[PDB]
Amino acid sequence: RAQLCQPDAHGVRRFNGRPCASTTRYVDGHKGACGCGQKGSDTPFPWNLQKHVTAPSERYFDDGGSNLWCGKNCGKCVRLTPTGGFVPGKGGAPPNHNPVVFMVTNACPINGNEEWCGISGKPGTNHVNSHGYEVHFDLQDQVGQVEALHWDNPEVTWEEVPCPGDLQANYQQCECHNS
Ligand SMILES: OC[C@H]1O[C@@H](O[C@H]2[C@H](O)[C@@H](O)[C@H](O)O[C@@H]2CO)[C@H](O)[C@@H](O)[C@@H]1O
Numbered sequence: 426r427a428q429l430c431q432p433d434a435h436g437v438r439r440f441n442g443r444p445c446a447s448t449t450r451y452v453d454g455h456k457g458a459c460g461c462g463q464k465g466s467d468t469p470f471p472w473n474l475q476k477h478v479t480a481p482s483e484r485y486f487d488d489g490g491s492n493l494w495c496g497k498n499c500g501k502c503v504r505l506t507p508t509g510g511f512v513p514g515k516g517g518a519p520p521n522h523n524p525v526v527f528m529v530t531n532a533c534p535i536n537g538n539e540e541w542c543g544i545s546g547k548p549g550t551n552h553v554n555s556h557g558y559e560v561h562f563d564l565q566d567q568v569g570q571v572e573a574l575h576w577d578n579p580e581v582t583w584e585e586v587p588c589p590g591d592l593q594a595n596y597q598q599c600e601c602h603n604s
């Protein structure tokens with residue numbers, strides 16, 4: 426057993442009651458779906474390529490909706506804690522289980538990402554991806570910040586938390602702030 430979160434009676438993987446999430450890493454250079462770059466361009470602010478920012482799966486990104494621009498959960502923060510698990514052949518066990526906070530600045534759409542982001546309802550509705558998780562976090566890795574954590578697609582528990590002050594201040598520059 427590489428995945429340590431056991432499915433509950435509804436098929437949702439949990440660890441000691443807490444919901445689990447899968448994670449991946451991505452690089453694409455786009456401004457992204459929360460508008461964290463110059464208006465009218467596809468150029469991100471440097472912080473949005475450098476910091477701990479994430480593109481969640483679409484139904485969490487827009488809280489049940491399908492909007493891929495200024496989704497309802499733009500600017501929220503999530504704390505991800507590795508369990509030690511991973512999907513066999515698609516990750517590995519990390520060196521420690523320190524939790525890391527990420528801010529939502531982009532979206533992982535169902536289209537083109539069916540294995541990990543193809544979840545047809547928001548968390549709490551018992552819809553899961555192909556690996557049994559109710560939500561997925563794709564982690565921005567333009568500058569190698571995920572490799573610096575030594576995370577190779579870890580299984581995590583997840584929760585929403587208030588954003589650290591620096592990430593709050595960053596988000597104020599994004600076009601979706603106050604939409
Ligand atoms: O579709 C989500 C995300 O996947 C990333 O690729 C994964 C891949 O699916 C998995 O088999 C392999 O083990 O890990 C890579 C890296 O996390 C891809 O890099 C992203 O562009 C994509 O959004």
Ligand SMILES: OC[C@H]1O[C@@H](O[C@H]2[C@H](O)[C@@H](O)[C@H](O)O[C@@H]2CO)[C@H](O)[C@@H](O)[C@@H]1O
Nearest residue numbers: 453455456457458467493494531532534
């Ligand atoms: O980059 C501006 C552009 O972002 C679009 O979201 C994309 C995002 O660029 C890409 O990094 C991610 O993997 O997919 C999302 C959703 O397709 C957004 O939908 C556009 O409105 C926006 O102009």
